[PDB]
Amino acid sequence: MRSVYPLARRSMAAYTMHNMTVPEPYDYLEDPENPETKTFVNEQNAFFEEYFASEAELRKKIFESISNSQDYPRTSNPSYINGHYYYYHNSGLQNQSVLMRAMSLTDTAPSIFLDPNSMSSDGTTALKATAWSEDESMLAYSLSDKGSDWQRIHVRRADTVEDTSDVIEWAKFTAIAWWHNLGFFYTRYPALQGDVDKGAETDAAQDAFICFHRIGRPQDEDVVILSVPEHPQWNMGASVSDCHSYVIVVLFDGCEPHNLVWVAELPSVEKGLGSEPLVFKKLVNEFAGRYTYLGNEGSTFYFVTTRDAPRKKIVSIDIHTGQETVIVEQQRSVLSQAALVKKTLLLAYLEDVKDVFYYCRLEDPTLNAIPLPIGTITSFFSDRKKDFVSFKITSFLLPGRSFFLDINDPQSSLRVFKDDTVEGLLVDDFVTEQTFYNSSDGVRIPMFIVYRKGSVSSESPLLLYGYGGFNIPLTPAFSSSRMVFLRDLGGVLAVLNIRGGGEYGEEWHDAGRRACKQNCFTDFIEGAKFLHRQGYGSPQTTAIMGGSNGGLLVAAVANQAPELFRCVVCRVGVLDMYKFHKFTIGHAWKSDYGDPEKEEDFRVLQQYSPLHNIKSGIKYPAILVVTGDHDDRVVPLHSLKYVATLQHMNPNEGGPFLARIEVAAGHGAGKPTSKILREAGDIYTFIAKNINASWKE
């Protein structure tokens, strides 16, 4: 097309930054308050709508298709307790989850057991915490209301499931710790945050204090068990031993991972509850790293330990002498969940952003694996005395699957306890896989590719998704948008974890941060080569998109191979690194970028800034940028600068320019589902339009 466009004005304004007179001809759109910027935004929306007017029919079709994937019943892990199967359910039109029991694995109609949606007229409270008991006669659960401690917490039984007259009041972030038939320890503070003589606006809730509680009795007949007197600005919890004759207590200073371990002898049943807390034997009184109790056996205890190992090794501990031994030295990856049942330690490793299971005996610690599908843990239930165990895997085209097995021979006992259903899915037809390829200089880079059973070729649309930064990896999780991409248009989804994120942790950040960050944008480009050299798809039509810093990278890769791609989408990204620290909360990511006044930081920055590298003549893909006009996460001046500059710089070359925007009235409130759903529909109909995706007819 050779049609005209609004004349994006250019001014002589040029802040001479570091003795360099960089032109800033678009000082107009550095503030929403001008009329010029508002009218330019209006014209951008009008042009995008005009471009999509003809394809609006299929756009509405795909929008309905994606919107149809927002209501979904979702189950959770099972629990075989006292001959029943307790598990969670969800219908879709409600705001909390329900809990109920089934007589067996193949129950047809379950029986409701816990409905948090009824006891309150608002019905906004939810089960914040839960705990069974040795006698299994009652489930102690916390009913948290609107976050604040002004709360109603209730209890319903099991044999009768009426509600007893017993309440736990004035507690936040509680770890209920039940012991046989007497009761449980729970957290609270002195003075019960009583009003009248009350100040501090419930700030930091000083003097955390755990005390026992016995059902049936009033609140006053309780014996305090531990409250840190000298360091009241802490937060601690407690739990009981498997023998249930001893109690252990964990403590935490602020939110520091560092932890100290304190064990204790709980008084026996024959003496009720003792008058004084017994001696709390001191094993670790330090602040090295995070500890987490997993189990015990007589004179032994076992913990997940991050001490001298940021990858959460697993170690035993002995009390009566203190001499120590190591169970599992940390592997090449990090931990997600762990458990100790009967005569096996059962572990899950977050290897290359996917959880792999292993079971370890007590003589051969070899990590014997199971062929669970590609994905990650999202839930776990395990009891030492119950041989049944279960877990839940989630992935891209695996919205959620609860599996179960025993602990005798884990090979064949693995089975699908529950599979969630969303209309229009067969699961097995979409196979996911991982593949490693060499980088630009020769370090292995992973790639999660989801694709059909060999039903795609050089002609199939190929999409890339990446965010890559801020130590936060893009773990495999379901998204309805990827669902529509896989099932509605015959495309394949390739997610690459470029250097910068939390795929390998702080080392991964070090591989792609600040000065050494630049090569990251190179390596991603190399990925586009590999996926086309192998055979999956063709460079003649391909798509990429990402968000925030990812929205940056999908634009940065426009420099190294400008012609190679065919269409890209950037969302809520940073698009001008020269106004980085001067606006909004952006400067808070200095650790990633750095200020534009440091010498070497600006020297590295100025060679890759997207607003200083778009250049005429060269060939560019089709670019879409989507942005909200007042979103304070990333101020939208950068997106408007980018789109206007290349709208008025390279007219008759590779493009075009697309500027999807979120203009409305009433900023500063929450985001309803309508906005996100319509925006996802718009971006997905754009990609489906341009990269030549064949709709499932």
Both tokens of 650, joined, read: 């390279």
Helices (H), ranges, 366-426: 410-413
DSSP states of 88-133 as a string? EE--SSSSS-EEEEESSTT-SS-EEEE-TTTSSSS---EEEEEE--
Q: Are 462 and 417 in contact (CB under 8 A)?
A: no
Whether residue 213 lies in the annotated active site = no
Order of strands, sheet of 326-328, starting from the edge strand that comes earlier in the sequence? 291-297, 300-305, 313-318, 326-328
Whether residue 180 lies in the annotated active site = no
End-to-end, the C-alpha distance of the chain in Å comes to 30
How far apart CA 119 and CA 473 sit, in angstroms, is 39
Whether residue 667 lies in the annotated active site = yes
How far apart CA 161 and CA 117 sit, in angstroms, is 16
How far apart CA 478 and CA 485 sit, in angstroms, is 12
Closest CA to 488 of 238, 680, 651, 648: 680
Closest CA to 115 of 103, 125, 130: 125
Handedness of CA 375, 379, 385, 386 (dihedral sign): negative
Number of H helices, E strands in the chain: 10, 36
Omega of the bond prior to 473 within 30 degrees of 0, cis? no
Query: Torsions phi, psi of 27, nearest 5?
Result: -65, -15
- In sequence order, the 6+-apart residues with CB closer than 8 A to the CB of 158 are 113, 136, 137, 138, 139
How far apart CA 633 and CA 671 sit, in angstroms, is 13
Q: Are 273 and 267 in contact (CB under 8 A)?
A: yes
Both tokens of 512, joined, read: 């792609």
- Residue 683's Cβ-side half-sphere holds a number of Cα atoms within 13 Å equal to 27
CA angle 663, 688, 569 (to 5 degrees): 50
Residue 118 to residues 88, 97, 125: CA-CA distances in angstroms?
16, 12, 9
Q: Are 483 and 474 in contact (CB under 8 A)?
A: no
Pick the catalytic residue: 97, 144, 548, 609? 548
Q: Are 237 and 249 in contact (CB under 8 A)?
A: yes
- In sequence order, the 6+-apart residues with CB closer than 8 A to the CB of 180 are 133, 134, 135, 244, 269
- The radius of gyration of the chain from alpha carbons, rounded to an integer in Å, stands at 29
CA 223 remoteness from chain centre = 40
How far apart CA 59 and CA 48 sit, in angstroms, is 13
Closest CA to 356 of 345, 367, 364: 367
Q: Are 643 and 625 in contact (CB under 8 A)?
A: yes
Q: What amino acid occupies position 619? A: K
The CB density around residue 185, as the number of other CB atoms within 10 Å, is 26
Pick the catalytic residue: 406, 532, 631, 648? 631
Q: Are 395 and 434 in contact (CB under 8 A)?
A: no
Please give the positions annotated as active site. Answer: 548, 631, 667
